RNA sequence: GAGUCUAGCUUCAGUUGUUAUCUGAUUGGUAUUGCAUGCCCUGAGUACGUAAGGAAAAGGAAAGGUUAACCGCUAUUUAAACAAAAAA
RNA sequence: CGGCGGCUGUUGACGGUCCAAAGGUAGGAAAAUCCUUGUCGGGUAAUUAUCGUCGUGCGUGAAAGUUGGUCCGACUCUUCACAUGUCGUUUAU
RNA sequence: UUUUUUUUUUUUUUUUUUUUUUUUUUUU
């Protein structure tokens, strides 16, 4: 090429929302479909930055349809899900998590860097407020009055800054016009959380940090080196 | 019809359509008249407008149904089914003809 | 539609004496049918019919008293007609676009 | 709208039963209501006494009509109506007659509304 | 030295065609028209003419046709269907 | 086993004369042939295109294969009917 | 919600609309 025919050509050209896939309606949306699994069974996927910008379109609306907790929801749920393990998943892990976050459960990282192969651009999709994140997420609800109480009581030019939005959070004593001195106060049972229904074992479980632990050894591996597999196969050459 | 000649028009007519909008709302009715079909299209808001009388209704579910904007059911509309052909000129895949194909298989 | 006159054609002027005359239909169109054979005429008929008449009734009903209309002069297997009510007018949006001769009888 | 090589049905009580237009002042096939055109008789009665070549002037459309009160009038059959001498040439019309007709043979009319 | 807005030049066709004397306190002294198809109306049944017959100065309007612009209305086609509650 | 015609007189059955083995038979006939508009009739707002017919305008011509009842048709042409962006005049995915 | 004529509007200006260029700098 010339390089000069890319900007002779675009001019006057508008934008397209919805970026272009190899081949037919019915099969980029199968892709899409499928790619929106394989993001729920992962954590974080790599893929090319074109399409990480387009997949979190769907990324945002399945979990923002997965909280409705209706049967009309349902349905559409239902119709952007393949496998039952990450159904299974949005339904008992990622639904208890985003209880308190208005939107915006997923982010795009660019690596400023190209394809050995293809000299192509690279980027992460990973979920927000996950463990071994790329960087950390900011609190919400209960959490972010409290931060925000933290930093009024900080020094005072937080106390100035959050002068006028801490009135509306309630964080404002009227009666003495100072800020509140117990932040515990304002605590409320969430969603998440388990309401009330209202030993000498030999057999019992260990506390541990992600699940609990079981008094007896297993010789298992992980889930994850269980099952091995060849990744690729040579093909020789016939001359 | 004529504010100079002082002449006046009654049409009567049953109505097939509601275009409802903001200010450019309308409203179509369909009759006969010696076996001949005439449909006119009025709108809501027109200061031309003597009287409007409504001779018989149909208060029903029906009519809420079709007064109202539903919304899909499902996102299966994405698919597409209508784009799903086969070019004149490209290579030959299983028993389809040149054109839309079809689902069933 | 029709450049010259065509051969005489006693059944469908039957048929729309008798249509027009018990059914009182707002939008009423007949054609012959050349699907049915290009070289027979005056035979087999198709057209589009609609009346107040079909309003709050069920699509069995609706097409009984068509069938029960038609045995009445004899030609009940010999109308392919589409009918349907008023207020579902826009189900017959891909039926009026086509073409609709005007036979002289 | 209307256009060359085409049928149109005769509203008066004249006998003639359909005609095809020979002529129109137009170029795009766009024409309108009260617009005068020149007819050829296809079909005729046992008791008529039409001429070969008819003059009339375009009465029904079946196009829909804008008026300018933001309107619009729309019909089932195209159809006219013979003129000579500046006067139709039968006594009564057929069907209603559309508002949107300069010409005073619409007075013959039954409903001018409809 | 630098930012903005601009003078001059340039621009479809084409031209050089404008103002003596000067209301005595008496309602004051040129003024944005270059241009042009057809049919209808006022002027007008007037000028003209035994009769038949039948003009112009000016303006006003309904078709057809060309160029350009635009999406308020209509027609064709087509897309979208997601975050008001700090108890969330 | 190549083919088969002149003058002249009354629309003209008939009469004169030259030549020759014999002097186009019948049928078809504006033609796989003359002429790229022969008269009249049917179709269309227009038909010289095409069918029917007349048999003169030039002319073809019988086991050289002529004519053709019925049946038959990947053989020319006239004409009727449905849909149709072929179109005036071009749009959207 | 977008495009288009099959819809709508204009048929005026030409010292006008518009524009890439401040020029007393006669040897960068």
Same mark, same amino acid.
């Not at chain 1, 939107?103 to 927000?128: G, I, K, S, W």
């Not at chain 2, 003597?50 to 899909?72: G, M, N, Y």
């Not at chain 3, 008449?53 to 009940?76: C, H, N, P, Q, T």
């Given at each position: 090429?010339?390089?000069?025919?890319?900007?002779?050509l675009?001019?006057?050209?508008?934008?397209?929302?919805?970026?272009?896939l190899?081949?037919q309606?019915?099969?980029?949306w199968?892709?899409?479909?499928?790619?929106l699994?394989?993001?729920?069974?992962?954590?974080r996927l790599?893929?090319?930055?074109?399409?990480?910008?387009?997949?979190?379109?769907?990324?945002?609306?399945?979990?923002?349809?997965?909280?409705?907790?209706?049967?009309?929801?349902?349905?559409? &749920?239902?119709?952007?899900?393949?496998t039952?393990?990450?159904?299974?998943?949005?339904?008992? #892990?990622?639904?208890?998590?985003?209880?308190?976050?208005?939107?915006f459960?997923?982010?795009?990282?660019?690596?400023?860097?190209?394809?050995?192969?293809?000299?192509?651009?690279?980027?992460?999709?990973?979920?927000?407020?996950?463990?071994?994140?790329?960087?950390?997420?900011r609190?919400?609800?209960?959490?972010?009055?409290?931060?925000?109480?933290?930093?009024?009581?900080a020094?005072?030019?937080?106390?100035?800054?959050?002068?006028?939005?801490?009135?509306?959070?309630?964080?404002?004593?009227?009666?003495?016009?100072? &800020?509140?001195?117990?932040?515990?106060?304002?605590?409320?049972?969430?969603?998440?959380?388990?309401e009330?229904?209202?030993?000498?074992?030999?057999?019992?479980?260990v506390?541990?940090?992600?699940?609990?632990? #079981?008094?007896?050894? &297993?010789?298992?591996?992980?889930p994850? #080196?269980?099952?091995?597999?060849?990744?690729?196969?040579?093909?020789?050459?016939r001359? | 019809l004529?504010?100079?000649?002082?002449?006046?028009?009654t049409?009567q007519?049953?109505?097939?359509?509601?275009?409802?909008?903001?200010?450019?709302?309308?409203?179509v009715?369909?009759?006969?008249?010696?076996?001949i079909?005439?449909?006119?299209?009025?709108?809501?808001?027109?200061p031309?407008?003597?009287?409007?009388?409504?001779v018989?209704?149909?208060?029903?579910?029906?009519?809420?149904?079709?007064?109202?904007?539903?919304?899909?059911?499902?996102?299966?509309?994405?698919?597409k089914?209508?784009?799903?052909?086969?070019?004149?000129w490209?290579?030959?895949?299983?028993?389809? /003809?040149?054109?839309?194909?079809?689902?069933? /298989? | 539609?029709?450049?010259?006159?065509?051969?005489?054609?006693?059944?469908?002027?039957?048929?729309?004496?008798?249509?027009?005359?018990?059914?009182?239909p707002?939008?009423?169109?007949?054609?012959?049918?050349?699907?049915?054979?290009?070289?027979?005429?005056?035979?087999?008929?198709?057209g589009?019919?609609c009346?107040?008449?079909?309003?709050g009734?069920?699509?069995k009903?609706?097409?009984?008293?068509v069938?029960?209309?038609?045995?009445?002069?004899?030609?009940?297997?010999?109308?392919?007609?589409?009918?349907?009510?008023?207020?579902?007018?826009?189900?017959?949006?891909?039926?009026?676009?086509?073409?609709?001769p005007?036979?002289?009888? | 709208?209307?256009?060359?090589?085409?049928?149109?049905?005769?509203?008066?009580?004249?006998?003639?039963?359909?005609?095809?237009?020979? =002529?129109?002042?137009?170029?795009?096939?766009?024409?309108?209501? =009260?617009?005068?055109?020149?007819?050829?008789?296809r079909?005729?009665?046992?008791?008529?006494?039409?001429?070969?070549?008819?003059? =009339?002037?375009?009465?029904?459309?079946?196009?829909?009509?804008?008026?300018?009160?933001?309107?619009?009038?729309?019909?089932?059959?195209?159809?006219?109506?013979?003129?000579?001498?500046?006067?139709?040439?039968?006594?009564?019309?057929? =069907?209603?007659?559309?508002?949107?007709?300069?010409?005073?043979?619409?007075?013959?009319?039954?409903?001018?509304?409809?």
């Amino acid at each position: 090429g010339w390089s000069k025919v890319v900007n002779f050509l675009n001019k006057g050209v508008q934008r397209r929302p919805h970026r272009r896939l190899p081949g037919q309606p019915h099969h980029q949306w199968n892709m899409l479909k499928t790619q929106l699994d394989q993001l729920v069974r992962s954590d974080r996927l790599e893929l090319t930055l074109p399409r990480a910008h387009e997949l979190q379109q769907y990324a945002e609306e399945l979990v923002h349809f997965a909280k409705q907790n209706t049967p009309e929801s349902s349905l559409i &749920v239902e119709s952007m899900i393949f496998t039952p393990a990450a159904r299974r998943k949005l339904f008992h #892990e990622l639904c208890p998590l985003y209880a308190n976050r208005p939107f915006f459960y997923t982010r795009v990282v660019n690596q400023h860097r190209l394809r050995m192969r293809d000299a192509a651009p690279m980027a992460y999709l990973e979920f927000v407020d996950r463990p071994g994140e790329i960087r950390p997420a900011r609190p919400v609800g209960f959490e972010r009055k409290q931060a925000i109480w933290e930093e009024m009581q900080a020094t005072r030019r937080g106390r100035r800054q959050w002068w006028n939005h801490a009135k509306k959070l309630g964080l404002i004593d009227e009666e003495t016009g100072d &800020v509140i001195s117990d932040i515990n106060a304002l605590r409320r049972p969430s969603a998440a959380e388990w309401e009330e229904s209202d030993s000498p074992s030999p057999y019992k479980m260990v506390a541990a940090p992600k699940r609990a632990l #079981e008094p007896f050894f &297993v010789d298992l591996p992980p889930p994850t #080196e269980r099952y091995r597999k060849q990744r690729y196969v040579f093909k020789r050459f016939r001359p | 019809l004529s504010r100079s000649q002082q002449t006046f028009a009654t049409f009567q007519g049953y109505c097939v359509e509601v275009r409802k909008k903001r200010l450019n709302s309308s409203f179509v009715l369909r009759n006969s008249y010696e076996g001949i079909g005439v449909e006119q299209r009025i709108p809501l808001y027109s200061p031309r407008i003597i009287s409007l009388k409504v001779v018989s209704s149909c208060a029903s579910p029906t009519q809420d149904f079709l007064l109202e904007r539903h919304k899909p059911l499902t996102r299966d509309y994405r698919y597409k089914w209508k784009y799903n052909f086969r070019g004149r000129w490209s290579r030959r895949i299983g028993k389809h /003809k040149p054109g839309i194909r079809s689902v069933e /298989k | 539609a029709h450049k010259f006159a065509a051969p005489p054609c006693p059944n469908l002027l039957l048929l729309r004496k008798t249509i027009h005359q018990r059914l009182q239909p707002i939008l009423f169109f007949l054609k012959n049918d050349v699907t049915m054979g290009n070289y027979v005429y005056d035979q087999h008929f198709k057209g589009v019919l609609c009346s107040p008449l079909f309003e709050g009734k069920s699509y069995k009903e609706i097409y009984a008293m068509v069938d029960r209309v038609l045995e009445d002069i004899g030609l009940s297997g010999r109308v392919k007609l589409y009918c349907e009510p008023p207020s579902l007018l826009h189900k017959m949006k891909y039926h009026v676009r086509k073409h609709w001769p005007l036979e002289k009888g | 709208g209307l256009w060359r090589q085409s049928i149109v049905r005769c509203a008066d009580n004249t006998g003639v039963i359909k005609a095809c237009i020979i =002529g129109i002042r137009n170029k795009y096939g766009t024409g309108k209501i =009260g617009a005068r055109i020149r007819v050829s008789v296809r079909d005729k009665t046992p008791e008529c006494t039409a001429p070969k070549m008819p003059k =009339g002037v375009i009465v029904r459309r079946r196009k829909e009509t804008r008026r300018k009160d933001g309107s619009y009038i729309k019909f089932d059959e195209n159809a006219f109506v013979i003129i000579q001498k500046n006067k139709a040439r039968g006594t009564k019309i057929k =069907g209603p007659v559309p508002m949107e007709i300069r010409h005073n043979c619409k007075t013959l009319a039954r409903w001018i509304f409809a």
